[PDB]
Amino acid sequence: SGATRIQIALKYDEKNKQFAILIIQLSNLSALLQQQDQKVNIRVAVLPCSESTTCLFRTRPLDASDTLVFNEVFWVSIAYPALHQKTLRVDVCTTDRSHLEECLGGAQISLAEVCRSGERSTRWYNLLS
Amino acid sequence: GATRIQIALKYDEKNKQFAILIIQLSNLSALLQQQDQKVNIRVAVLPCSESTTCLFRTRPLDASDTLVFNEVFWVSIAYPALHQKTLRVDVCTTDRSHLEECLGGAQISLAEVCRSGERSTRWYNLLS
């Protein structure tokens, strides 16, 4: 196999001064989670946390699979100068028995490319352990 | 694997200028086995506008599995016209008579290009 990839869309709306993070789908989860009787969630964090609005989001948990479809958007009330300098950390995290959290891989993503003009960027990102 | 090409796209709106930076080519050996020949990149802004320049070529460099072209192309075009265009990049081989036969390429959408000017760097697979 290859690496585990995750597909995400990014769009910034300056009228309403908010940022959209759409977690679309995960691919090749087997590269990170070999035994798959667990449920995984995508953990999303806008770093630095910023000491005002929610910086930590988490998808619903789904039964592991090598083609896993979350259609969860998260909105964050931010302005472009702040946003433009931030980092997006995403991790595929599972939970073992007794709701413990363990994260199997992730990626930090520069937002310097996010478009102030509001165009959507849709890319695949590799999650490394 | 597959021959990949890394490209960055930035749009200047004060001026009406579009920048296409051909950055590098990875796993060229997936398309060109005999790497003794020389290689260049062909780039076309489609639909090719008459009364405008649309086709471009990089300098020809000796075939490497990892080959860095560091070569920008500038186009005079506006965002409305840019927004419905498509980019055709092919990896081609040329000899000294400048006979060009192309080994593969890809069609790239410019719907993500930022009008605000933010650069967009990405890899693309070149297909046979």
CATH of the domain at A73: 2.60.40.150
The angstrom resolution of this structure is 2.6
For residue B28 the two structure tokens come to: 């060229």
Alpha-carbon span B73 to B32, nearest angstrom: 25
A116 chain-B contacts, CB cut-off 8 A: 114, 116, 118
For B17, the domain range is 1-128
* Length in residues, chain A: 129
Number of structural domains found in chain B:
1
Identify which of A116, A121, A122 has the shortest CB distance to residue B116.
A116
Q: What does A71-91 look like in DSSP terms, one character per residue?
A: EEEEEE---HHHHHT-EEEEE
Alpha-carbon span A41 to A18, nearest angstrom: 23
**What residues contact residue B9 under an 8 Å CB cut-off, 6+ apart?**
B18, B19, B20, B21, B110, B113, B119, B120
B104, B109, B115, B117 alpha-carbon torsion, rounded to 10°? -30
Could you tell me whether strands A62-63 and A4-13 are parallel, antiparallel, or unpaired per DSSP bridges? unpaired
Q: How far is A90 from chain B (nearest CA, A)?
A: 19
- Please answer whether residues B49 and B38 qualify as being in contact, where contact means their C-beta atoms are separated by less than 8 angstroms: no
Alpha-carbon span A65 to A40, nearest angstrom: 9
- Please answer whether residues A41 and A93 qualify as being in contact, where contact means their C-beta atoms are separated by less than 8 angstroms: yes
For residue A86 the two structure tokens come to: 């931030």
* Cβ atoms within 10 Å of A70's Cβ, excluding its own: 19
For an interface test with B, give the residue of A8, A12, A113 to mutate (most B CBs within 10 A). Answer: A113
Alpha-carbon span B50 to B34, nearest angstrom: 37
Could you tell me whether strands B61-62 and B38-46 are parallel, antiparallel, or unpaired per DSSP bridges? antiparallel
- Taking only residues 100 to 119 of chain A, the set having a beta carbon closer than 8 angstroms to any beta carbon of chain B reads 112-117, 119
Residue type, position B89, single letter? V
B111, B115, B118, B121 alpha-carbon torsion, rounded to 10°? 20
Closest residue on chain A to B115 (Cα):
A117
CB-based contact, A60 to chain B, within 8 Å: no
**What residues contact residue B70 under an 8 Å CB cut-off, 6+ apart?**
B21, B22, B23
